[PDB]
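step 4 of 6: structure.
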Amino acid sequence: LLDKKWLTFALAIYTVFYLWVRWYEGVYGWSAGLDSFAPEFETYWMNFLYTEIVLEIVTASILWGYLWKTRDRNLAALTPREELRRNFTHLVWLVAYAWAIYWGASYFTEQDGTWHQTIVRDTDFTPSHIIEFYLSYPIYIITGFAAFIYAKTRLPFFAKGISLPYLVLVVGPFMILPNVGLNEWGHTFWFMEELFVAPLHYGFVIFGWLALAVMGTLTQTFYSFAQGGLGQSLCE
Amino acid sequence: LLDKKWLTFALAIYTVFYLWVRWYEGVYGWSAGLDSFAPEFETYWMNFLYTEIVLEIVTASILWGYLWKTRDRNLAALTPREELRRNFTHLVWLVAYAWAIYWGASYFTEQDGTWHQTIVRDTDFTPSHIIEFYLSYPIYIITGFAAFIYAKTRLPFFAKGISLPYLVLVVGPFMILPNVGLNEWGHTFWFMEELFVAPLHYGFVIFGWLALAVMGTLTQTFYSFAQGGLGQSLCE
Amino acid sequence: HGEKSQAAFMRMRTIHWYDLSWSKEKVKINETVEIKGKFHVFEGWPETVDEPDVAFLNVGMPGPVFIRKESYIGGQLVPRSVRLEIGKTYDFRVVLKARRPGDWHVHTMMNVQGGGPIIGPGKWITVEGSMSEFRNPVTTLTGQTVDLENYNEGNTYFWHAFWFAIGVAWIGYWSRRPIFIPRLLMVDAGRADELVSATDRKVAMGFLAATILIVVMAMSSANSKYPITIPLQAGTMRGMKPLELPAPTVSVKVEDATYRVPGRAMRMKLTITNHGNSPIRLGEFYTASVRFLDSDVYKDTTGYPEDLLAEDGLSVSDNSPLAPGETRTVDVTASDAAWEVYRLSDIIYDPDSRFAGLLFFFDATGNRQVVQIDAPLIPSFM
Amino acid sequence: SWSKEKVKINETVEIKGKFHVFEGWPETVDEPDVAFLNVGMPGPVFIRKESY
Amino acid sequence: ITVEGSMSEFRNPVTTLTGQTVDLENYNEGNTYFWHAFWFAIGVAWIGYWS
Amino acid sequence: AVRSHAEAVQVSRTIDWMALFVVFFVIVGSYHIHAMLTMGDWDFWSDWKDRRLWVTVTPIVLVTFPAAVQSYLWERYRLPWGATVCVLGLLLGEWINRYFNFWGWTYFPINFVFPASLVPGAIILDTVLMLSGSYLFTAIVGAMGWGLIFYPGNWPIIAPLHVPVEYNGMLMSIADIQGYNYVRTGTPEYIRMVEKGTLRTFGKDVAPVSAFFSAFMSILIYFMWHFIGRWFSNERFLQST
Amino acid sequence: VPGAIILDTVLMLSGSYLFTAIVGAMGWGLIFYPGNWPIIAPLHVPVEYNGMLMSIADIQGYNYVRTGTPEYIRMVEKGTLRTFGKDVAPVSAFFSAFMSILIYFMWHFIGRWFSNERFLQST
Ligand SMILES: CCCCCCCCCCCC(=O)OC[C@H](COP(=O)(O)OCC[N+](C)(C)C)OC(=O)CCCCCCCCCCC
Ligand SMILES: CCCCCCCCCCCC(=O)OC[C@H](COP(=O)(O)OCC[N+](C)(C)C)OC(=O)CCCCCCCCCCC
Ligand SMILES: CCCCCCCCCCCC(=O)OC[C@H](COP(=O)(O)OCC[N+](C)(C)C)OC(=O)CCCCCCCCCCC
Ligand SMILES: CCCCCCCCCCCC(=O)OC[C@H](COP(=O)(O)OCC[N+](C)(C)C)OC(=O)CCCCCCCCCCC
Ligand SMILES: CCCCCCCCCCCC(=O)OC[C@H](COP(=O)(O)OCC[N+](C)(C)C)OC(=O)CCCCCCCCCCC
Ligand SMILES: CCCCCCCCCCCC(=O)OC[C@H](COP(=O)(O)OCC[N+](C)(C)C)OC(=O)CCCCCCCCCCC
Ligand SMILES: CCCCCCCCCCCC(=O)OC[C@H](COP(=O)(O)OCC[N+](C)(C)C)OC(=O)CCCCCCCCCCC
Ligand SMILES: CCCCCCCCCCCC(=O)OC[C@H](COP(=O)(O)OCC[N+](C)(C)C)OC(=O)CCCCCCCCCCC
Ligand SMILES: CCCCCCCCCC(=O)OC[C@H](COP(=O)(O)OCC[N+](C)(C)C)OC(=O)CCCCCCCCC
Ligand SMILES: CCCCCCCCCC(=O)OC[C@H](COP(=O)(O)OCC[N+](C)(C)C)OC(=O)CCCCCCCCC
Ligand SMILES: CCCCCCCCCC(=O)OC[C@H](COP(=O)(O)OCC[N+](C)(C)C)OC(=O)CCCCCCCCC
Ligand SMILES: CCCCCCCCCC(=O)OC[C@H](COP(=O)(O)OCC[N+](C)(C)C)OC(=O)CCCCCCCCC
Ligand SMILES: CCCCCC(=O)OC[C@H](COP(=O)(O)OCC[N+](C)(C)C)OC(=O)CCCCC
Ligand SMILES: CCCCCC(=O)OC[C@H](COP(=O)(O)OCC[N+](C)(C)C)OC(=O)CCCCC
Ligand SMILES: CCCCCC(=O)OC[C@H](COP(=O)(O)OCC[N+](C)(C)C)OC(=O)CCCCC
Ligand SMILES: CCCCCC(=O)OC[C@H](COP(=O)(O)OCC[N+](C)(C)C)OC(=O)CCCCC
Ligand SMILES: CCCCCCCCCC
Ligand SMILES: CCCCCCCCCC
Ligand SMILES: [Cu+2]
Ligand SMILES: [Cu+2]
Ligand SMILES: [Cu+2]
């Protein structure tokens, strides 16, 4: 069996959900979403913010708790074939993390750019901010934490210790979410110019760099893949 | 034989050429060299720039290629006396590098200072810039590269690896030449004040520091000198 | 010699120099030449140039071929930086004393703290004699007359040579013994503790004590001699008195302005309204150190530089006298080789294609009016 | 002018006058774009009730 | 302010000093697309060659 | 190898002279670049040699190379003249350029374009290192002295230039008149970073306060550049570039 | 893509990372503007727009209103008194190439660190 169709679901769920989110923000961007003090803004974007925050907290708790509770206690008695299957599942988790990272840190971030350069931002919770800071960022954070936990709890290579590159890749992009405090603070106060390259935005930049730890993470996963079932063929 | 009269030539060629260059710039500094759009400026300084750039490229290519092609293949079967002679020749190369570094980074650099503090600079290719950035800097770069290549190709101590202090001493002062882009950019744009201590000039400063690697380079050459013919006498 | 490279629009709209005069064209060593004139700070000061809050009246010249004896803005000496107001006209006077023989292109320039050099018209001034005859005497408040050419030179040389000799003595004292390789081997192979031993420490203590004592004694001696000293006098000078010019009786509205690419001419259409009570005629157009003259109306007699002077470079479609109260629109063409020699045609390369200048209107009796014009300058290619 | 030279506790003393900002303001001092009318005194031996 | 019609009917003509009239809605769009696609194709070809 | 003890001694002496040349002139080039681009403007002009900025900046930026060269030479050879050789090389390069370019090419007088004196500070730094070989003690005490002795060391040279002169209705020092008369087309007066007075300048404290600030910052810069020179001495063989 | 291709080929040939940082980064900085010139050149055709000279890109920015992006935010070339002749683009390109050398040198080691396969035992 090895690599199964969980990868198709991993791609499709993010693609479909974010396409629907884009449709929603295209429909309610203007017209209930321009005026932050209008009653329709509360029903179409503040309610969205509340619901998405509650659902993200619940989903993160449930997913992480399930992954930690179903952790493999007897990692020693794991066959190489099962280890290969678990390595493929972890690679599917990493693919989902990469897809979520794309959707969060490229699509909706530059969408925040094109929203703020063309409207006068009315609050810290513009529809763009609700979608990007509080939906896509938590979603990719949840996916990254889940992938890290799966590696630690199913892969003997990633067990017996916390991998530094994986921890950086998982936590650095997470630090972008608390960095929103710098975004709002240096915008209301420091810098009223919409300048997307303003130093108030270098918090995203610095912690966006930590995603480069995916390189060490991926060579670690390559070594984990090539533990018992490394071949032969490769180097033979 | 050991140390031969190549050292006298090494000193004299730089001394004579740069004395003639100083005479040339004293004669044509004013009077074909003040107005960068005058026809005489093209015949006396733009032609100088073109000729010197072509000659520097040709000389660098020929010298480096000859030094690399005549590299000693059988370094193992090198007698201590021949090694001592080659060490003295490398020391002559280092003396030539030091002389060229002086002429480039002290004489013509502060000459650029006294030129710009007293005329209104008319272009990125003032006679001072032509002499300093595009003659003396390439000359000392060529000399440093030649000395490094000679060490690597004739001295067994400097073979079997790239010496970090020598590489720094050779490449850092070279980085001053591309740093001219910062000099011109931060002068036309950033900083219209002639301030010689302006941060637009800290590119020269930072890469001028890398010449301090001559200390590690020279202790390496001392060890290379004291390999087989270290004495005795010294420490005896 | 530093202009013709600056941006054409920046040379056009910073500072307009006019009524320039030179006392002499050829001087001897130690002889004085005086440069006078007026400069007007343009209202449309470019945002890339800092406002002339801190400005210095300088001289454009190849090193001290002249010495600046005096410089005035208004009627008061300005040895320091000064504050200028945008839109104001000031009169200036620079006194130069010849120092170096030769033919020198002397410019009057204004350096602005955050914008760089604003170079005015330059004039060739011939200096004859010998540099050895130059003297720069000055009398101090302590009652002594010194020549600034060589005053304190001997003392400076003496002290620098003395300290250099002290350092060289230290280095040579340590350099009498073998220097690099045996000392390196001694330090590496085992503890060294042998290459620095008495009386080396005694010599170093003597060097340190002598250095401190000599510095203290020299400072005390230089305080007993020259007991009266003052710090360097610096600081921007405010309250420059601008000229109180009468309000112009001529109003000019620029209706489009074009220049051919390539070409040596600039064309503009002006609506001139004559107020007051005298028939006026357009006599001059000054744009950036270049004076386009209508020779039938006005002739230059102040010895303006020839390469900057267009004697008949200003052609007006209808330059008949303009009766008071009458308004007419004419096509004005300013054409001269200077427009390309001084790269005023290179405004096509500039990121701000706007020009500014001064129009000089003359009546029959000869009294003149200065009006300022500024408009976008549109290139024409076909 | 000073309203009183000797006061009791809780008593009010008023200081009046004029000040002229010199035209030749030194360049080392920033222009008085932001200025505060203060009282030079060794701590709150008086309290500033009003300032105009 | 109410706007009625279709966005497809919008035109933004402008005449240059070189004597040509262009519509700012789509002027240079084809050239931009072509050059970006060409360079992207070059990079993709490099990557696929190594892949 | 070498023939005998005598020939080894002669070879060592020749190496000594050649390596001294190499050290001296590489230091001249690098140190002069650093100095002229970190303190050059004050060093160029007597009317820039003020009590605040000149006294503050010059020792701070000039202690850099002496610290590194000391950390190498003393540590590896027990040669206590790294600071002296750095300062002598800087002075030689500066004087050569002043005489042949400032006064030679252009015709600015030497009494206008003379450099500052640094040998007293260099001697203090070297002797304080050799005695009490502690690099920390050097960085604290010798750098203090290097910063503090700068202005008193240069006072005999610049004191005659500070005689007051009544010049056309305005009070000017002789250095001020030099800067006024000898036109620097590229160097207007406002570029001059000199003492201009403040409302928080209490009494006659401008020179000593600047000297003490320069001494403290010199301690800091010496501490940094000792380790910078320690790194620059590395004899590592970076296998590939 | 041209700069990326230069950087990659200069690395593969002459595998020296130092040689890449010096030469390939130089080329990456220098080829940026010439690489984009075919795209933006048509937008720089001069236009006489309501009495003022404007490029086509200028008219685009003027017409297509960016409510959050006023014109003054634009950090573009505005001319200086020390801008000599026709040097704005080449000078900027060479400055960018030098700074690209520096940034490439820094980020080579940054990426070296980010590749670490260490197992930080506890967080
Ligand atoms: C990592 C964990 C992430 C957790 C957060 C998830 C956020 C979900 C959206 C919040 C909505 C909100 O809050 O708003 C509630 C909205 C407000 O719209 P309405 O006014 O009712 O109009 C009618 C509804 N339309 C406008 C959508 C037609 O209505 C709803 O009930 C509909 C929400 C549907 C969400 C599920 C579909 C997603 C795409 C399919 C692939 C997954
Ligand atoms: C991973 C992190 C999850 C955290 C979830 C949030 C828990 C909130 C607890 C109640 C706080 C409260 O009610 O008080 C917060 C007060 C509200 O102030 P107010 O509305 O101005 O006035 C007072 C009104 N009262 C009296 C009714 C409260 O201060 C603030 O403005 C802060 C509000 C910003 C919260 C940002 C959370 C973003 C989470 C993103 C998850 C993906
Ligand atoms: C590391 C490799 C370095 C390569 C660069 C070398 C640059 C050489 C100079 C460029 C000249 C130029 O370009 O100009 C060409 C000049 C222009 O002068 P002219 O108008 O002909 O007047 C007549 C010539 N006078 C004014 C010199 C009298 O004339 C020439 O033919 C003469 C150039 C002579 C150069 C060789 C002598 C150097 C001193 C002797 C010790 C070596
Ligand atoms: C070690 C490095 C050696 C490199 C040697 C130089 C190779 C030049 C190749 C041709 C480029 C060209 O012709 O084009 C460069 C264009 C010229 O632009 P333009 O004159 O304004 O107008 C266009 C005019 N055309 C159409 C006739 C070209 O851009 C520039 O302004 C950059 C010019 C600065 C080059 C600085 C080189 C310094 C080398 C120093 C060596 C010691
Ligand atoms: C051997 C031990 C005994 C000697 C102890 C010396 C004590 C101070 C002498 C002051 C001389 C004087 O006269 O005051 C100070 C003189 C100016 O004097 P003024 O113009 O009269 O100032 C008018 C005001 N007064 C009357 C109150 C003095 O300069 C100075 O502002 C020097 C300021 C230095 C500040 C930084 C010091 C850092 C110290 C670091 C230590 C590791
Ligand atoms: C290891 C410590 C070695 C110290 C060596 C000191 C030698 C003597 C200097 C006399 C200075 C003078 O005469 O007074 C102060 C004057 C400045 O005076 P000014 O008011 O600016 O006027 C200038 C015009 N004059 C000279 C006609 C008045 O010079 C200085 O700026 C030196 C400041 C540093 C003094 C360091 C000593 C204090 C203790 C240091 C240890 C914590
Ligand atoms: C293959 C070897 C031979 C070729 C050598 C090329 C020499 C230079 C060519 C200049 C072209 C030209 O025309 O001048 C320069 C052209 C503009 O020209 P302009 O508008 O006429 O300038 C008017 C003034 N003038 C007449 C005196 C030229 O752009 C530039 O300002 C380019 C400035 C680049 C500055 C940074 C360079 C950093 C180099 C780093 C090296 C490692
Ligand atoms: C490894 C080195 C590879 C170099 C590849 C160069 C390809 C040819 C570029 C022609 C540029 C041109 O045509 O001239 C210069 C023009 C700018 O001109 P502008 O005056 O601002 O006007 C703009 C409007 N135009 C285009 C109608 C005139 O473009 C540039 O900004 C490029 C600057 C970098 C030139 C690099 C070559 C110099 C030597 C480099 C090695 C030290
Ligand atoms: C607690 C801090 C107070 C200051 C002390 C810091 C000095 C520490 C330096 C150090 O680590 O020791 C190095 C040398 C060791 O030499 P010794 O062989 O101990 O010589 C002792 C005899 N002597 C007093 C003449 C020195 O000893 C010396 O460095 C010299 C010791 C004499 C003090 C004065 C020297 C400095 C002159 C300016
Ligand atoms: C302006 C800042 C000052 C520059 C000083 C930085 C020097 C950094 C040290 C360094 O370069 O490391 C070299 C390694 C490559 O290692 P190797 O080539 O495997 O050498 C083996 C031994 N060694 C690992 C200890 C080097 O890393 C590499 O990938 C090779 C790059 C070497 C470039 C160093 C040259 C610096 C010249 C400016
Ligand atoms: C002193 C500085 C002058 C520039 C030299 C810096 C290059 C040093 C790079 C290096 O360390 O060596 C790596 C390779 C080794 O390959 P080799 O097996 O030596 O190949 C030799 C045959 N060859 C000439 C076709 C290359 O050799 C190469 O890197 C390629 C050598 C050919 C030079 C041109 C390559 C660069 C193209 C832009
Ligand atoms: C924005 C800057 C980029 C972040 C990169 C900094 C990483 C610093 C390295 C580090 O975290 O050291 C871990 C040690 C704890 O050590 P241990 O848990 O004992 O691990 C044993 C092996 N080890 C000592 C080599 C780690 O020190 C500790 O106390 C544990 C702290 C680990 C936190 C690292 C996670 C960084 C995520 C942002
Ligand atoms: C790899 C990221 C793909 C992002 C595509 C996207 O944002 O799609 C939304 C956009 C919306 O434009 P349109 O297709 O015209 O439909 C408009 C519907 N709303 C306004 C809700 C977005 O176009 C599509 O829906 C095309 C489907 C692409 C599937 C990968
Ligand atoms: C890594 C480079 C950081 C450079 C910081 C920068 O560009 O700041 C520009 C800003 C200048 O403000 P400005 O661009 O004029 O802002 C105009 C808009 N307002 C006045 C509303 C802020 O300076 C500061 O306020 C200090 C920044 C500290 C950085 C750690
Ligand atoms: C260690 C660096 C020596 C630099 C000396 C220098 O720049 O010399 C030029 C200068 C030029 O002044 P001068 O001798 O009067 O001859 C003028 C000739 N021009 C104007 C061409 C320089 O003086 C000399 O030629 C003296 C020879 C010294 C030999 C080491
Ligand atoms: C290591 C110390 C670097 C300190 C930088 C500095 O002194 O900059 C002064 C300058 C202030 O400009 P100013 O001196 O007023 O320049 C006057 C002349 N103009 C207006 C033409 C630039 O500030 C900047 O523009 C930011 C520098 C960033 C350094 C990484
Ligand atoms: C700021 C000073 C840092 C100097 C670096 C020295 C590193 C030494 C490692 C062997
Ligand atoms: C500024 C670049 C510094 C990168 C840090 C790399 C550290 C590697 C240690 C193994
Ligand atoms: Cu001139
Ligand atoms: Cu004017
Ligand atoms: Cu007053």
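step 5 of 6: annotate
 - The interface with chain E takes residues 1-2, 4-5, 8, 35, 38-39, 42-43, 45-49, 56, 59-60, 63 of chain G (CB under 8 Å).
 - The pocket of diundecyl phosphatidyl choline (ligand 1) is lined by residues A 13, 16-17, 20, 24, 44, 47-48, 51-52, 55-56, 59, 138-139, 142 (CB under 6 Å).
step 6 of 6: archive
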